[PDB]
Every structure is written in structure tokens, then in C-alpha cells.
Amino acid sequence: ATKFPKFSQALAQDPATRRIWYGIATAHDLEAHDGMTEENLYQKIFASHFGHLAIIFLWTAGNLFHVAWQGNFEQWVAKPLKTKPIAHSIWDPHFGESALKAFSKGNTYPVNIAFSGVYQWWYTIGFRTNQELYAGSIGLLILSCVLLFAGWLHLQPKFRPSLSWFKNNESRLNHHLSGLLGVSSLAWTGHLVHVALPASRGVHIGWDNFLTTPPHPAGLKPFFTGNWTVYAENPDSATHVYGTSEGAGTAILTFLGGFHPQTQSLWLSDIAHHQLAIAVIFIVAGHMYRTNFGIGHNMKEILDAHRPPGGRLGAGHVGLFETITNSLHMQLGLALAALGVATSLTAQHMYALTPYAYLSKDFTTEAALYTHHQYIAGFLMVGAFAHGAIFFVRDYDPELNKNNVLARMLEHKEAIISHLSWASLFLGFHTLGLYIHNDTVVAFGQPEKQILFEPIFAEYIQAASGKAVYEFNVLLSSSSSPATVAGNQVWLPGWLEAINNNKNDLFLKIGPGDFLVHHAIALGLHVTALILVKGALDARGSKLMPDKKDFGYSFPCDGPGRGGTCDISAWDAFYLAMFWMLNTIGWVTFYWHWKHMTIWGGNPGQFDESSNYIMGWLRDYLWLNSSPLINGYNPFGMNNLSVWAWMFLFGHLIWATGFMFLISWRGYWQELIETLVWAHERTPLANLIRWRDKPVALSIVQARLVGLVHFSVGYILTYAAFLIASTSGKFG
Amino acid sequence: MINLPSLFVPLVGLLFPAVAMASLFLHVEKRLL
């Protein structure tokens, strides 16, 4: 093509403004470009990966640079309980005099307070000065230059690697498990032992004395002699001023369990040992496949042999090896599904088992962190099913998987969908009905008539882990049990102390309010899955459109024929599912926040009683906690939180403009623009100017994507506005 | 230095986008390329 889109000859010959809009939005869809071969495809992606990797390290190098240059890291390290950490400074010519005085409360200049938790993270890994933070930022700027040179270097013709190199699964997997995950874990354990632990004990180890200062008195004699018990001897005392040598141990690899009594975070020597045990597992696991050395497995020979002789799974896994290697959308969909489970797992484990010194003290950051990883977990999950649908449309080969475990899923697709639909209807009817019953019963002044189911199952699990508050005497909470007798010596006493301490996050006290929300969260997960699974399984065709695969993944509709066909494409299923992800993460984030605001406020009973009916949520969570946010600015004056108040309204506006693109459709707008084209052509002195691209209304699929982006960006910005300033405006 | 933000922020906020919006406009509307 010779127009702006040089990759689409068919998009470059369009006379309307639609050409500009599409060249932007199809720029990364590499398989669909004019004259794209398979070998050139893999090369372009590879070099695109380098440039993406460099943007991450440039981003990190930024965050290190702004705190080293404008933060209060040094003042925070000295008094981590009283000073507020500093994101970066503000320079905006639009500020009044009272704005400069409002954003500089407690400092010398205008400044943003950080809620990223990079301070607590950097503190526990060793950092103590601004010089170290600045040195770390220079090393990541150099690393980004190397990655940008590699991306270019691998596009050269002598360094472009062949198609068979990209499909060597047995090698790649071997190197990623043992080298990328194992040796990195091993190296990280070396950093903890030499820098991290010593810095927590008042000893400074930097680049100038790490070669002459051993991290343990024994000094590697116990390691080569098999005397590994010496590294667990003499751990930190119960009363150890953290960061000082007052009550310091010498042990580098312990297994204490629970938290440090002073920072309320995990023991550094427990983390070092954890990273080391994990390093051994990943290094060993990276020796499973055969890579030009004779020994090892062939992945294809594994998969072909797994067909249970009962015949229940059909032909088993024959053909799956070819379908995964010959398709990047299936690989991408498997990778997005595991990352979405993983970043969701990090959101739950971080708030319960706080790993950084002084975490869960800065109330705002805990609220920023948990909801940050839960919203990102939602996008990843929705993107996994979205790419699962794309695979079926332009990558699935029916003859290659005859009677396969993959083919059989399409052969009873109506079962999966109809059953997913039943579970959703069941959860919806009962969970919604129970909430409404509690609302009317309390509205009438008879709250003793409420239906409050006790969550016995979750409580049992808690009792089995050691929680002695539900009086269940099951497992770890019953003293005469082989699970707790084996566990007392190695790590049980640190765990029991931490699990029975009320002022914690380790297994929060749950009641019948915790039971109703979980079934709402269940309903959210099932309906979202219903829309995504239905969209993937009906992507190739349905009764209403038996040749859907001929039109691709995304298309407007099939016209108003045979009833009408709006939102029939598999892309439309993704668009409809987006609303459910936003909604079921929103039910998770409201619940996690409300439960903490009442524990921090000192009245956990407030959430235990009002969370049974809906009005409780609406009045004691939303209406009661929005006070300091919307008082950010008023006729009397403005405060530091004025920006959150401005952002709060900002969100409501973008969300509401998203409604315009979602309710009002195209042929209304096309007719309107035709009168505007007319008017401009008839007005003297405006006639001298003329467009080079015929103005037209946004298309059917473009309006859904735009209306979706507004609904999304408005949705996320208004909650960020609420959750940050309601916590920082009350601090408890 | 401490004098740097009053130099970059007009350049990054007003100058860079005005050059970038001008550059893309010329590229998007250029016929043989």
C-alpha cells in the first residue's frame, strides 16, 4: 500500500475518515498484514518483545530516579512510622497560591504522596540511601539500551533466527524452568543473604566490601560438609530493633513461620530459604525434556500416549502437539490464563501474609495494591478467553483433532453452555433473593427475621489451619493430632501465634456477611465465564449462523434478516463480558475495602451487621465514606485531596459519555454528518478549506469499542478516586 | 537541576505533542510512501 496504512492495501484505498481509525486499530494484528509469511511473522514478534522489555525497565528506572531525586527515602528510613512517602514533585502553572500551600503540607514544595508501596519494598531489600537508589536507576537505563540494541540486532539478516528455532519447545522449556526461573531464584537468594539480611541487622554491605565480608560466621564450611544446620542456629530475638544490631541473630536460612514482632512482616531468613528451596525445584524440573543429548522426553510422544483405555476421553491427546506449536493464539491464551490466576493469587497472599517491612500500616497503599492486582487480574482473564475464541476461528483444524480431547469439547458445547447457564440462574435467583428478603425485613423494623447462613465450610478450613476461635478442634487446632505433633517443632509455634492474633490479616474473622458476598462473587465468576465460554464455543457457527467462521472473529452483524443478528460475532461476546469483569471485580473490591475500613476504624461489628442487606452497603460504605473525598474542594476552600475530588467527577463524566456510544447507534449519526458536510460546503469563507478524508460516522464495531473504553476508563478512575481518598482522608 | 521542571514540562507538555501531531498529520495524508 502507498497510503498511511502501508500494511493494508484494502484499508489504504478508503476515501473516508474510517481509514485513519482502522490503521491505528489493526496495526498489531500481524497475521493479517499484506504479504505476511510465517517466518517474517515470528521475527517481527520477537523484536517487538525486546522493545516491550525495554519499556518496562525504562519505567522502573523512572520510579527509582524520582524518589532518589525528589523523595524522602532517607527521612523515611529513619522514621518509617511518621513520615509520608513522596511520589514526585508537582510543577503546574495552573495552580493558585493556596494550591501550592495545600500540596506542600509538611514539605518544602508541591508534591504527590506515593501509594505504590515501592518504599516498603526497597527498604526490606537493602536500600538505605539516595545514592543507592540513583545507582540502580542508571543500571536499568543501560539495560534498556542493550535490549533496544538486541531487538535491532535480531532483525539483521545474519542474526534473524529460523522458523525451526522458534518451534523448539523442548529446549525453550528446559531453559525457562532451570535458567530463567531457577537460577534467578538462586541469585535472588544470594542477594538476600549478602545484602538484605545484613542490612536488617545494622550491617552495611555494598559493592565495596561484599567480597571481604562473609554473610555468616561459619563461612561456607557447613555447606560443603553437609552441616546445613549451622545456618539455622541463633536467629533474631523476640525483641530485636529492626535495622539495628540490638538483638540480632546470625542465621541465614531459618523456618520460623509467622511474622517479625516489630515490622509485622515475614522473616527475611524465611524468605531466603523459601527462594532457595524453590530454586532447587525449578532447576531440577528443567531437566525433563530431551535437547540433543539423548536423555529426556519428547513432548509429542508424551501427549500421544495419554488416552485412558476406558475410552471416556475419546482419542485422548493425539494431535494436541501440532495444534499448540502451529498457533500463537492458543499459546497466548494459555499464558494469559496462568498470569491472570497468578496476579490474582498475589493480591490475596500479599494482604494476608505481608512480606515487606511496615506494610499493612500505610492503610492507603494496602487498598491501592490489592485493587490494582485484582483489576489487572480481570483484564488478563478476559484476554485469555478472548484469544481462546480467536484460536477456534482462524487456527483450529477439525481434521487434525478428530475425536481429540479438544474436538469433544465442541461436540457437547450445548451441554457446557446450558449447564453454565443453570448455575448462573441458580446463584442469581437465590443470592439476590436472600439480600432482598433481609432488606424488607429490616426496613419493617424486624431484623430478627433475617436469613443469615453461617459459613461453616470456610470456618472449618480456618480451624484446620490452627484458628482456635470457632471451637472446632479440627487438625492444627486440636493438640492431640499427628498433623500438629509433627508441626510443632519446625514452624508451628510461629504460625499459631500469628494465626490467633486478632490484629492481623491471617484468616480474618468471617461471619454471615462474609457468606453472602462470596456467593455474589461466585455469581459474578459464573456469568462472566458463561459469556466467554459461549463466545469461544459458538465462534465457528450456530443455528442462526452456521458459517460464522467464514466472516472471521470480528464483524458488525448478519443484517436484520431471519429475525435480526446484532452482536452475533465472537468479538461481541468479549465486549459483553467486559461489563461482567468490571462488575465482578467491583464486587470484590468493594467487599475487600469495606471489610478493612471497619477493622481499621475499630468497629468490625459495623460491617458484620450492615453487610446482610443492600442498604447497608449503600449507606454505611458508599454514602458514609465519601465525605472527605467530596469535601476536597468547596466554596470555603480546597485541600490536598482536591485532585481526587476532581478525578472523582472526571470518572463519572467519562463513564456517562460511554453511554452515548452504547445506546445511540450509527445511522442516526451518519444522517447528521451529511447535513454538516452540506453546511460547510455552502458557507462563504469556509469554502476555501476542505477535508481530504470524507467525514463519516464511526462504524458499528468501532462504536462498541469506543463506548467500551469510556465505560472502562470512567469506571476505573472513579473507584481509584474513591478508595484512595476515603482511606487517606480518614486514615483508619 | 532544581531549575529543570520549569524547562521540561512546557517542552514535554506543549511542544512535543504539537510536533508529534504535526508529524503524524503529514504522514497520514501523504499519498505515495
Binding site: 522493545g51 531525586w69 540513583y134 543501560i142 534498556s144 533496544l148 531487538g151 535491532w152 | -
Partner: peptide, 28 residues
């Protein structure tokens, strides 16, 4: 905390910006 350190950091960002404009040239 030193002015000279800031100057060094954006020469390396200028070299980095040059390798990025050069990397994109080749992707197109």
C-alpha cells in the same frame, strides 16, 4: 543529590531514545 549525576542520567536517556527511534525504523 549531585547536579552532575542528573546530567549523566539524561545523556544515557538520550542514547536510549536514539536506539528506540532506530529500533522502530526497522520494525516498520
Amino acid at each position: 543529590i549531585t547536579d552532575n549525576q542528573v546530567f549523566v542520567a539524561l545523556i544515557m536517556a538520550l542514547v536510549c531514545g536514539y536506539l528506540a527511534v532506530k529500533l522502530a525504523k526497522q520494525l516498520a
